[PDB]
Design a binder for this molecule. Sequence first.
Ligand SMILES: [Zn+2]
Ligand SMILES: [Zn+2]
Lengths: 121, 51, 45, 20, 67, 45, 45
Amino acid sequence: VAFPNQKEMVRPLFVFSDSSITHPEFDLFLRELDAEGLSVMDLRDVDYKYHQLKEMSSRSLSNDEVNSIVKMKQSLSSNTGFNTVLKKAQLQEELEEARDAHDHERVARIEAELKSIGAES
Amino acid sequence: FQSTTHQKLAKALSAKQKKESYARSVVTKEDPEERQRRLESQENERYRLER
Amino acid sequence: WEEPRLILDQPAQHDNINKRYEIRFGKIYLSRPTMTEADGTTHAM
Amino acid sequence: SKPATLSDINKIIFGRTAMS
Amino acid sequence: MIIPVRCFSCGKVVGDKWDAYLRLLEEGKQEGDALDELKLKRYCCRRMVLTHVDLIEKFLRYNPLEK
Amino acid sequence: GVKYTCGACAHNFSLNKSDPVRCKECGHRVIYKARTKRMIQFDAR
Amino acid sequence: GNKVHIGKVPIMLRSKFCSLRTLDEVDLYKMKECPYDMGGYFVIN
Ligand SMILES: [Zn+2]
Ligand SMILES: [Zn+2]
């Protein structure tokens, strides 16, 4: 984002407040736009944004989109008990595959990884 | 019994039948029926082309 | 491995060429149970 | 081409909960 | 599942003595002596505390369904 | 319009009778309806 | 000539090829499985 008077800034989402914009805030924003020499968004563009938000909020996600969002949050997932159990089970399956294939090098790494992940309370 | 030959024979025959593992484990990453349906689709396509 | 060999023969004459076609069965591989969804993805069950 | 009023901006309020 | 509030036979309140009973058993008292200390004289009331199985401790180990 | 709850991560969301039955965040395939809002009364007997 | 899928075999619970064989007491609780359950059966449909 960017203030008109100030410069560009990268901000996270939680900084924004759910409270509505007050009259002096919008007036100060208009004064900053006039100082920089900019205009306000057109009413046609305002309606286009409103229709875009309503369509996006009322949209129905597809299976592929839902899986992509789930994979994205799984990449963001630091830890979750169900997911840790599933990962440990998958690692155990990979470990038995490596043991049955007589691969003495992979199995040590999988055992070390399981030891690091494990030791619950 | 205390003869070394008898003890070695007993040990060898006891541990010989202990080792028994034929099936080897594997990890499935995709649907096992994917190959069947994709090859059926290719066969149907080439059947149409041949016809 | 009880019946490990299927055999098909064809004494083709159409220069006599005796052709035997045979397939052998090898190892058995097993996995942990898996679940396949309608959208095509798979995961441990 | 008309300027946007306060109510027009209020129609497109997108809260932090809505963002999440 | 969880300790009954009243004795089934006579209706004496026994639901306020479970933690004290566990404390007394922790200190090393015998079960009969612990029941005597809690003033449970009739064997109908002694049966209620002596034969109770605390199943709620097993039910609480499953993760909550709503948060 | 109707609230749900995920069977794995206990997350609350809503459905509009057109989305796939899935959890939004962890993608579990099992969801549960939320408790009603009507008054619930018992006779304590 | 490689691995051909010849079918799916139902798995007996708590056996060497079941997913619950490894899980300890805590993950068994997280998987909504009762620790008093002994296995020895199959789950068909
Ligand atoms: Zn009594
Ligand atoms: Zn979930």
